[PDB]
Amino acid sequence: QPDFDAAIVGGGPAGSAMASYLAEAGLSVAVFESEMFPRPHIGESLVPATMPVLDEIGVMPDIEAAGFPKKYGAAWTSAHNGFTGLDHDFKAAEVMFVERDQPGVHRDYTFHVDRGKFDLILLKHAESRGAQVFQKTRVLKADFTDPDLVTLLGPRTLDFTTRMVIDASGRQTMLGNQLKVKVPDPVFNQYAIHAWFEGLDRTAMALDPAKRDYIYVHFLPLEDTWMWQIPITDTITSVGVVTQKHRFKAASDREKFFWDIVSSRKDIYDALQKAERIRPFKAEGDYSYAMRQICGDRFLLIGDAARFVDPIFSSGVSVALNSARLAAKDVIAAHRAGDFKESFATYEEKLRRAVRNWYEFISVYYRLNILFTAFVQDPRYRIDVLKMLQGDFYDGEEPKALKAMRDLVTKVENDPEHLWHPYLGTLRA
Amino acid sequence: QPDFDAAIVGGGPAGSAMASYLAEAGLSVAVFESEMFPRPHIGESLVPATMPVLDEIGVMPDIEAAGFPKKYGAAWTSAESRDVPHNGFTGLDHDFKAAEVMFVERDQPGVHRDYTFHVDRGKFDLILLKHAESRGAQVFQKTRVLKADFDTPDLVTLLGPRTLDFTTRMVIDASGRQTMLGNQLKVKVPDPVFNQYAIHAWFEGLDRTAMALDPAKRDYIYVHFLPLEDTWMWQIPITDTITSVGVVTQKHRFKDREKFFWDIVSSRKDIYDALQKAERIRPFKAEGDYSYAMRQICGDRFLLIGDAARFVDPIFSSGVSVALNSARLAAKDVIAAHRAGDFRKESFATYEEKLRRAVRNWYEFISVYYRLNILFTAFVQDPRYRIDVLKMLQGDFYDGEEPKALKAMRDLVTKVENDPEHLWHPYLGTLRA
Ligand SMILES: Cc1cc2nc3c(=O)[nH]c(=O)nc-3n(C[C@H](O)[C@H](O)[C@H](O)COP(=O)(O)OP(=O)(O)OC[C@H]3O[C@@H](n4cnc5c(N)ncnc54)[C@H](O)[C@@H]3O)c2cc1C
Ligand SMILES: Cc1cc2nc3c(=O)[nH]c(=O)nc-3n(C[C@H](O)[C@H](O)[C@H](O)COP(=O)(O)OP(=O)(O)OC[C@H]3O[C@@H](n4cnc5c(N)ncnc54)[C@H](O)[C@@H]3O)c2cc1C
Numbered sequence A: 001q002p003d004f005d006a007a008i009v010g011g012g013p014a015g016s017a018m019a020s021y022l023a024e025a026g027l028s029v030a031v032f033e034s035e036m037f038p039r040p041h042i043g044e045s046l047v048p049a050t051m052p053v054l055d056e057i058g059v060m061p062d063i064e065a066a067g068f069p070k071k072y073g074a075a076w077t078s079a080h081n082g083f084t085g086l087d088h089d090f091k092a093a094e095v096m097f098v099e100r101d102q103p104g105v106h107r108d109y110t111f112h113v114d115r116g117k118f119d120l121i122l123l124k125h126a127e128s129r130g131a132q133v134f135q136k137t138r139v140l141k142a143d144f145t146d147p148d149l150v151t152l153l154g155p156r157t158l159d160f161t162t163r164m165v166i167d168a169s170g171r172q173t174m175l176g177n178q179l180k181v182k183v184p185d186p187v188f189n190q191y192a193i194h195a196w197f198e199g200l201d202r203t204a205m206a207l208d209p210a211k212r213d214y215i216y217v218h219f220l221p222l223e224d225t226w227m228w229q230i231p232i233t234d235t236i237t238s239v240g241v242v243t244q245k246h247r248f249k250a251a252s253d254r255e256k257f258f259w260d261i262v263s264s265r266k267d268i269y270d271a272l273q274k275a276e277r278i279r280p281f282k283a284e285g286d287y288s289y290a291m292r293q294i295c296g297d298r299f300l301l302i303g304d305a306a307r308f309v310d311p312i313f314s315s316g317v318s319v320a321l322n323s324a325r326l327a328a329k330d331v332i333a334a335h336r337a338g339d340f341k342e343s344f345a346t347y348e349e350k351l352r353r354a355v356r357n358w359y360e361f362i363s364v365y366y367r368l369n370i371l372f373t374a375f376v377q378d379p380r381y382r383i384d385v386l387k388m389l390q391g392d393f394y395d396g397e398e399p400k401a402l403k404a405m406r407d408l409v410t411k412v413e414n415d416p417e418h419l420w421h422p423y424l425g426t427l428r429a
Numbered sequence B: 001q002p003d004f005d006a007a008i009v010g011g012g013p014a015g016s017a018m019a020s021y022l023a024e025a026g027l028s029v030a031v032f033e034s035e036m037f038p039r040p041h042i043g044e045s046l047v048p049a050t051m052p053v054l055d056e057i058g059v060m061p062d063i064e065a066a067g068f069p070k071k072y073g074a075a076w077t078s079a080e081s082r083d084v085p086h087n088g089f090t091g092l093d094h095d096f097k098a099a100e101v102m103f104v105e106r107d108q109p110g111v112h113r114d115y116t117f118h119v120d121r122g123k124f125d126l127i128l129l130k131h132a133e134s135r136g137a138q139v140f141q142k143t144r145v146l147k148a149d150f151d152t153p154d155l156v157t158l159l160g161p162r163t164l165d166f167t168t169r170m171v172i173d174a175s176g177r178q179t180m181l182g183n184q185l186k187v188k189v190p191d192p193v194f195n196q197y198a199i200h201a202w203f204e205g206l207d208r209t210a211m212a213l214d215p216a217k218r219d220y221i222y223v224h225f226l227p228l229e230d231t232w233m234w235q236i237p238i239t240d241t242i243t244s245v246g247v248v249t250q251k252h253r254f255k256d257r258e259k260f261f262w263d264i265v266s267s268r269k270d271i272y273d274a275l276q277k278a279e280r281i282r283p284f285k286a287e288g289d290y291s292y293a294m295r296q297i298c299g300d301r302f303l304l305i306g307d308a309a310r311f312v313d314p315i316f317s318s319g320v321s322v323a324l325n326s327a328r329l330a331a332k333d334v335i336a337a338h339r340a341g342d343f344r345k346e347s348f349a350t351y352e353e354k355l356r357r358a359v360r361n362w363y364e365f366i367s368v369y370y371r372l373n374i375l376f377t378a379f380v381q382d383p384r385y386r387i388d389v390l391k392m393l394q395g396d397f398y399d400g401e402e403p404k405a406l407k408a409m410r411d412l413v414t415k416v417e418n419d420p421e422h423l424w425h426p427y428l429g430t431l432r433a
């Protein structure tokens, strides 16, 4: 007599994807979302590992019809020790996703996206495939009896019953907090400040005007600080700064600080000065964490609710989408067999490994800093580095690039006369 | 203490607009919507009387950013092939096979633009409903109101496997064609004359120039009438590439809706052939029993707006403007009633009187179209009447004083009806009861 077979907390990319998979499989599914869509949300530039999932669940047409800017590649700018391919020294690197064959991907492009629209399309698509979706409905607790009662809408409180809970709460980590298994990263503590601008000329930063719809990461000449530049429409562009919380606390105000930091680079500063900010400044903080358990009897965690690290590689949505995919296979087998913790270990193992790679790849980047440019551009490393940049880490093998980069960061770190020793970033793992 | 000052049943254009007005004004407001948005919905081509309301409530930017096709004008064509006596009328550039308009030909108060829009109602209603939330309203989707209990503040009885109650001082029924209170209170009256039936779908890749007078007019709404059968078909842009196409006919004819749709479209080769090159991107839906009125549209602690209060026939694309402007007028009364602490029926008579009148104009204007179509054509095209008739076609029927053109039409239809040897008597149309 439970209301649902599964209940999903949160309707972002993880939640919507999960529900859509579960409904196609024949389960009674509910999705609870405390907001009303469309709702603004950070995390806009996708990587091609999103696409197989979006195809599989049958939403690509609806995505294609939305008119999001296509993303053909990614670029880095800023302002040799045997490395080559460096046509522009360390002021520019570029890569195109099609340079490497990626399994499950048959296109040249993915998308940069207004998350408001993007999440709405996935959430309505979940409804079209059978899921019961409940907006402005906040889940307060999962009370663990033979099912779970979820306790939840305006002045009214209501309960619903499920055999299984799936936490897709993102950074609000509902069950992570409820069960007290959330662990903040002992090193990463970056802080993001961002906004949307209209009329920035994306040709400014572009070496070649065909590449101006790439994502641009702009390294700044401070410690562990950079900026993103992401197309949202022809005319609107999402810009954000990322730095250490300590820097932000070392200073005194969100706007003033954003511009101060951007002021470290004249060209971009002036370029942004030609634009009109179309949205208030929002901040993201305390977002690097993991969980000691990501599953238990009658629950599991997907998307940012299970982990998040740092958005330097634009992979968060692909992780949310692919964690949903993997978790579905386990939830479906558990439902059929009538048995909901150890039922979820395959999902756990495959996500632990996947996310270790992303993590370890990010730690290198920060130690490497600007030297990272060299690995994009040098052809011994370019294609391996691109595997990671594609979001492709759901494989047995340890990525070859991560080994090479780690080994090389070590040798540089230990040797104070190494040509690159002065260019090391200052955040370590 | 009640949960809300007002509670609104339905989140379409009437509901969303009402809520946004009420929140601006400082009331605690709730909107209940049984569906999840975006949801498909018929009724796509707007008239310029929508715009003042959309501006006033502060949602034009968000509409503008949606990229809806702009609507600069409309065309009403007729399959009439008999040689018809001009009977003194002029401007008949296309004889009696076509009449057309550009909304900017008349200055309309509150309107400063050249265009309105044709719209995906899915996206359009979402933007209004989220905008209402932005301005303060509490919105509850997939929440069905089953009854308004008035016998003890009203409790509204209502979400998945869960039933819940909420409290309000005042109920506003914006249920559209599901006429929640109209049915609950048994005050709904089907029209004794009208019951047309619509079949429609979306197509991708149609050349909109096919049906068009010329390819500059490709963006207009086109309605093609067969006056000897009270049957017509419409062509409404939805994107560059998607177009909404529909047929409207008498229910009795309808008593396999795909076959019928094509038969009716086949009456015009150009479009038929053009439609053959297109891809139907949505299933055929059918919209019926849509013409009705209500004996009461207000009472103690309730009132009805939009289609929940009345609907006639979509020939002039006015339904959304009526829903938006009824919301506007009803807000004034609801706001004054709230401030004075008095929601008795009589508090709402200004709204009632203005809407009775407004809607009587629309109604009588529609009857003429069906009953003597060539007359409709001649009045749109003739400069004695053109500008007054355009006022009505703009959706502007809330200032009151009877439009002069409508009176002249009525009087002329009478004379023709009574005289069987009047030159136009053989063109009078005929709707089955
Ligand atoms: C290109 C890119 C750039 C990115 N940049 C950044 C960045 O700059 N900063 C950053 O911090 N992250 C960033 N991310 C990561 C991203 O913003 C999210 O952390 C994550 O990737 C989204 O996955 P999700 O759907 O699981 O989370 P969400 O999309 O947040 O899913 C949670 C949703 O469920 C709802 N919800 C949450 N809790 C409850 C509850 N208790 N009851 C009911 N509903 C609830 C919320 O409305 C929320 O929208 C980025 C990701 C990408 C791909
Ligand atoms: C064939 C056809 C063509 C049309 N063409 C046009 C056109 O070209 N241009 C134009 O302007 N107009 C047109 N209309 C009219 C237009 O569709 C309606 O007038 C318009 O939708 C009215 O808005 P509303 O908010 O009053 O009702 P609706 O838009 O119908 O919204 C009412 C909402 O109430 C909700 N609801 C929530 N709770 C309940 C409950 N308990 N019971 C019932 N409902 C509930 C429903 O889900 C619905 O979303 C057309 C109508 C038809 C039939």
Ligand SMILES: [Cl-]
Pocket: A310, A311, A312, A313, A314, A315, A316, A317
């Ligand atoms: Cl990320």
Ligand SMILES: [Cl-]
Pocket: B313, B314, B315, B316, B317, B318, B319, B320
């Ligand atoms: Cl209408």
